[PDB]
Amino acid sequence: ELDQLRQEAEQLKNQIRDARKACADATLSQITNNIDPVGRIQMRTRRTLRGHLAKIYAMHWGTDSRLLVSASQDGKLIIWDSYTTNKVHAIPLRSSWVMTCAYAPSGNYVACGGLDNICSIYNLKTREGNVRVSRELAGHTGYLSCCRFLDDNQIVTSSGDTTCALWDIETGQQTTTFTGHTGDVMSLSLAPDTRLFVSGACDASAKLWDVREGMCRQTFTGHESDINAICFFPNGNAFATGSDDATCRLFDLRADQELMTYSHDNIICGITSVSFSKSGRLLLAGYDDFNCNVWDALKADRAGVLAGHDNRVSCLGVTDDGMAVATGSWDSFLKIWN
Amino acid sequence: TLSAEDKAAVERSKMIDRNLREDGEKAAREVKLLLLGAGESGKNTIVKQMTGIVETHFTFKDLHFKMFDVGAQRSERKKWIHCFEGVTAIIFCVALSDYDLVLAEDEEMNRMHASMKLFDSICNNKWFTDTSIILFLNKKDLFEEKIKKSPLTICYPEYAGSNTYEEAAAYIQCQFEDLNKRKDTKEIYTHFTCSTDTKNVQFVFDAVTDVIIKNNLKDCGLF
Amino acid sequence: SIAQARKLVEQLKMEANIDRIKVSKAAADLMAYCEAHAKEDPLLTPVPASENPFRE
Amino acid sequence: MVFIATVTGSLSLVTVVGNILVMLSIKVNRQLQTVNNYFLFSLACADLIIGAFSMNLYTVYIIKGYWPLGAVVCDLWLALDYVVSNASVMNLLIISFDRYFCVTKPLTYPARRTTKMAGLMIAAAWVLSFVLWAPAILFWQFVVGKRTVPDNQCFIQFLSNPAVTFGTAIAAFYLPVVIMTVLYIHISLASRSRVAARERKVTRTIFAILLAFILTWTPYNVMVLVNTFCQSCIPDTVWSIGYWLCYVNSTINPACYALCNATFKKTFRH
Amino acid sequence: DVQLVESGGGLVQPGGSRKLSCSASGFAFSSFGMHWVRQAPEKGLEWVAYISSGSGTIYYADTVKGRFTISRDDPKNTLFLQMTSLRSEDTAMYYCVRSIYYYGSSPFDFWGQGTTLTVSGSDIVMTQATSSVPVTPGESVSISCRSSKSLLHSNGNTYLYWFLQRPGQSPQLLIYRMSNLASGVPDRFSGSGSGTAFTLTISRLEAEDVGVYYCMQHLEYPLTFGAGTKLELK
Ligand SMILES: CC(=O)OCC[N+](C)(C)C
């Protein structure tokens, strides 16, 4: 009966692939032939945030488009006032091996996690005046790779044990566990209505989940290596991926297939971070060749290079109003671009 | 021109600057050792005299050591191995009595060859080009009791020396250091662990002293 | 291992049971969302330095 | 005829291009912005001054034979040249001390040396050179009350007095080269493994830098110690080339101190 | 809980000396810049001295400059105020005030319990037009403050601070930076302004809300309070 189940799975894979082929009446390149190009995007470094003394692994913007948190391997979580380059807080972490950091949309909490398999939640607005631990989320067996806040009580984490988990901060227990990936999950990004979230793993597959019922809605394939980065479109109807095979790919949640491939011949280095603009016209990607390309998301042409880092661009963030782009990197520097 | 609140915020940021600088100055004089090895290869038998990542902190000859254990990480290794790029040295533990045993996960596979494959991946990784490796070859008493009963030729078919302790031990020692590609860039220090106290930590201290001297030679421009 | 294969084929049946739209309509309204918010994007057009929070 | 000016102009060109490339390597490459490279920047500054103004004024002095600028300009440029040349030597001496304490005390000394203490060393070496050479060169003609140096010729006035010449030459070259010899012998001795290629490379680097300094500097010093006894012993053309030889040390200082590091070699090629 | 206990005050001769001590508990004292605010038995609040976090920046009032000195002891969590050459104008009540400064912080959030003392020109002037308003509960009372110059800075912040002193205890912070409501205060209190003209809109007035209301400015040192608008029943 095991061979019959494998045959049924293969038949369903063929059904999925020719259903995807059936709706592929035209590509994204044919529709956007007559639109105007964005021209040369020239962005200068407006601020430089110095203070970290190790490789910066992740940053997250605030929803006020001014505060930002950043994590690095020296055991310090630092909140920056990006307008004046002032350091509001400096959180000393118990474990210096962090790979992700989150900033709550209300602003009262930050999160971090990494090789200690623990998501630590820090309370910012404290009556005592210092930032303290509020809840340590233990449950994963693999390293935490990415985590985003839903609100002040719900946080979803992607881990290195091929699982995504939805947590309740007050109780400290996980409510929904998302299982389906075979490779280690590296990044997740959440929809603007916070009802769905995509998830990229090391098995070159992107899976669209549902936060409520906790089942995988769709699975997206088209990559050949470890997907390291993922980000929704601003409307929530599309998302982009970044992997080690030096390409970025745009998917559609409704057509359930590939839309556009972002790659060039001289680029042979993987992508560590992706982000969109406010309108979604520009797709920005952080590569390993020390640079950051700006892609026309509708025409798949490079539009500009944010060349200003002396090491690998590990993280990338865009403000909610689209004013600025922050590029952290392994050379202990955060740079604000505009 | 700043406000009074803005000036006090800048003063708070400068105090945060000096605290970060003194914390970094305390962290800069810290020996970071990444411990590696295979399962049941004597990984945990050297931390007694010297989930997630387990960090061991200890002092020897007024020098503080950070020793990191990543043996509990069952995930894919290359996604997090670049986090240990700036370590001083890598401690590698290989069991001497593991030349004639089969992996439980995969049949017809020696753990000596699996540890050799792990050493080949670690030593010749692109993140660890300059980092020296302190190779520990442990459980020599069981190896001495086992080499008389079991020959070494079932592990290495090309072995032609006698079945004595010293010749076979030196043979497999050279069979570990011949894997290094960049012999010039990195050194491989080799110790056979003993049940007597403070020998292993003395070897680690001498090896990291040599590594620190070589790094000072690199920074001063002599090498 | 039979139950894992049954769960996998049920997951593929659930993925195949969904409805899909044409790619041309997805391209069309994706282009429409890009063109509708073009004026609100300050990374495309150069924003003046008077209302720039970082140039000023 | 025209071959002297061509050779001297080419050597001065090599000096100034080499020193500014050292400066641009520290400036552009963030990996070279190290506390140990601030001493190399302090040495590049002295050698750029030497290769720009000291070499060119002394070569026109040779090809014309008579100093044409005057007496005030003669004493100012002698004050400038000797102060920056002793500053160069003292830069080499604090680099030897830096390297000796990093090898002999590898656990303690890099922690204790910061940018403030490195700036203190650089400032101490420069003021010591200035105090040693500039008050002597500019006051001697006044305190004595006479100008021994003729109008047409430009040279040090107190070379006729033997005691000041002995003490100043020992404190400028002789004592600093004995100290560098002892320290570099100990550096090469303490660079070997105690747990091959390392000792050979280090000895080669140390022999390169020590012979470069000694060869380009010893003729002038032994010439001034015999000149004070017998002025007519040393031919004028011998003196001219022995003087210019000291400038060659500044030219080849990028090659021996900076280009040994492989990070400089990639930056120079860019 | 955050607690500031003050001691050392009492009866002194004119021209004498007395040392004030404010003991701190329940908060990270080393990261808070402390103040001293003086209140006469008949008059309102008056700022005296300020020491920054880490004792880096110290200011004083023009009345008490040179005579008073302010020091803190972060290991033992004590704020000091050494007084020399005391006169009859210093016969008043003293408060130590907690304050912190970063982006979005709430300075002057907590006030000390208070100790009393008995002795035997370019500044911004905060003017409150009314000194006493008789108001019933359940009504919407507006309290206004005026400024000499515009409190609106180029960064957009209007540095206006509202305080309420209930009869019997320390003043408490209500509104910080003109429009932001504080923590632990009800939502009824609302504040707004326009650079020079300011107002505080209290709606559905309760009974515990009576007391004396003060305005203050943080735009420039010295810190000048208001005259004091008092709310009473009927
Ligand atoms: C001895 C001394 O300090 O300087 C000699 C170098 N020279 C001859 C070029 C001025």
mmCIF file of N, CA and C in Angstrom, chain B residues 210 212-214 216-217 219-223, chain D residues 99 102-103 106 187 193 198 201-202 205 260:
data_model
loop_
_atom_site.group_PDB
_atom_site.id
_atom_site.type_symbol
_atom_site.label_atom_id
_atom_site.label_comp_id
_atom_site.label_asym_id
_atom_site.label_seq_id
_atom_site.Cartn_x
_atom_site.Cartn_y
_atom_site.Cartn_z
ATOM 1 N N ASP B 210 50.444 29.944 21.370
ATOM 2 C CA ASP B 210 51.088 29.952 20.060
ATOM 3 C C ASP B 210 50.211 30.620 19.005
ATOM 4 N N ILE B 212 47.950 32.980 19.609
ATOM 5 C CA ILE B 212 47.944 34.406 19.927
ATOM 6 C C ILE B 212 49.241 35.072 19.476
ATOM 7 N N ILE B 213 50.373 34.376 19.632
ATOM 8 C CA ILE B 213 51.658 34.888 19.156
ATOM 9 C C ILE B 213 51.660 35.016 17.636
ATOM 10 N N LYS B 214 51.104 34.021 16.939
ATOM 11 C CA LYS B 214 51.022 34.085 15.482
ATOM 12 C C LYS B 214 50.084 35.197 15.020
ATOM 13 N N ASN B 216 49.562 37.995 16.706
ATOM 14 C CA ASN B 216 50.311 39.226 16.935
ATOM 15 C C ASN B 216 51.352 39.454 15.847
ATOM 16 N N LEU B 217 51.973 38.377 15.361
ATOM 17 C CA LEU B 217 52.888 38.480 14.226
ATOM 18 C C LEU B 217 52.159 38.917 12.964
ATOM 19 N N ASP B 219 49.358 40.759 12.913
ATOM 20 C CA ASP B 219 48.919 42.142 13.078
ATOM 21 C C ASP B 219 50.086 43.114 12.991
ATOM 22 N N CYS B 220 51.253 42.717 13.491
ATOM 23 C CA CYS B 220 52.415 43.590 13.469
ATOM 24 C C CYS B 220 53.088 43.651 12.105
ATOM 25 N N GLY B 221 52.680 42.812 11.160
ATOM 26 C CA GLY B 221 53.193 42.867 9.810
ATOM 27 C C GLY B 221 54.450 42.073 9.557
ATOM 28 N N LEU B 222 54.913 41.286 10.529
ATOM 29 C CA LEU B 222 56.100 40.468 10.310
ATOM 30 C C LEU B 222 55.807 39.311 9.367
ATOM 31 N N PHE B 223 54.646 38.685 9.514
ATOM 32 C CA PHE B 223 54.309 37.524 8.708
ATOM 33 C C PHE B 223 53.370 37.920 7.571
ATOM 34 N N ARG D 99 56.559 45.800 18.611
ATOM 35 C CA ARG D 99 56.650 44.410 18.190
ATOM 36 C C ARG D 99 57.287 43.528 19.254
ATOM 37 N N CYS D 102 54.653 42.886 21.951
ATOM 38 C CA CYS D 102 53.579 42.017 21.484
ATOM 39 C C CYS D 102 54.018 40.562 21.425
ATOM 40 N N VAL D 103 55.284 40.301 21.117
ATOM 41 C CA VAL D 103 55.757 38.923 21.063
ATOM 42 C C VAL D 103 56.082 38.404 22.457
ATOM 43 N N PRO D 106 52.389 38.470 24.891
ATOM 44 C CA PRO D 106 51.267 38.397 23.947
ATOM 45 C C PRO D 106 49.901 38.442 24.598
ATOM 46 N N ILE D 187 63.069 39.224 19.174
ATOM 47 C CA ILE D 187 61.811 38.952 18.478
ATOM 48 C C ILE D 187 61.913 37.676 17.648
ATOM 49 N N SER D 193 57.935 28.267 17.462
ATOM 50 C CA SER D 193 56.942 27.473 18.176
ATOM 51 C C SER D 193 57.527 26.878 19.450
ATOM 52 N N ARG D 198 57.589 29.780 9.864
ATOM 53 C CA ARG D 198 57.401 31.007 10.634
ATOM 54 C C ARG D 198 58.726 31.690 10.942
ATOM 55 N N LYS D 201 60.421 33.088 7.691
ATOM 56 C CA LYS D 201 59.741 34.303 7.240
ATOM 57 C C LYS D 201 60.050 35.502 8.138
ATOM 58 N N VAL D 202 59.992 35.306 9.459
ATOM 59 C CA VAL D 202 60.253 36.389 10.408
ATOM 60 C C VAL D 202 61.704 36.857 10.338
ATOM 61 N N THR D 205 62.168 38.882 7.171
ATOM 62 C CA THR D 205 61.628 40.228 7.354
ATOM 63 C C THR D 205 62.537 41.090 8.229
ATOM 64 N N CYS D 260 55.165 43.841 3.338
ATOM 65 C CA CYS D 260 55.216 42.486 3.885
ATOM 66 C C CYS D 260 53.821 41.938 4.165
#
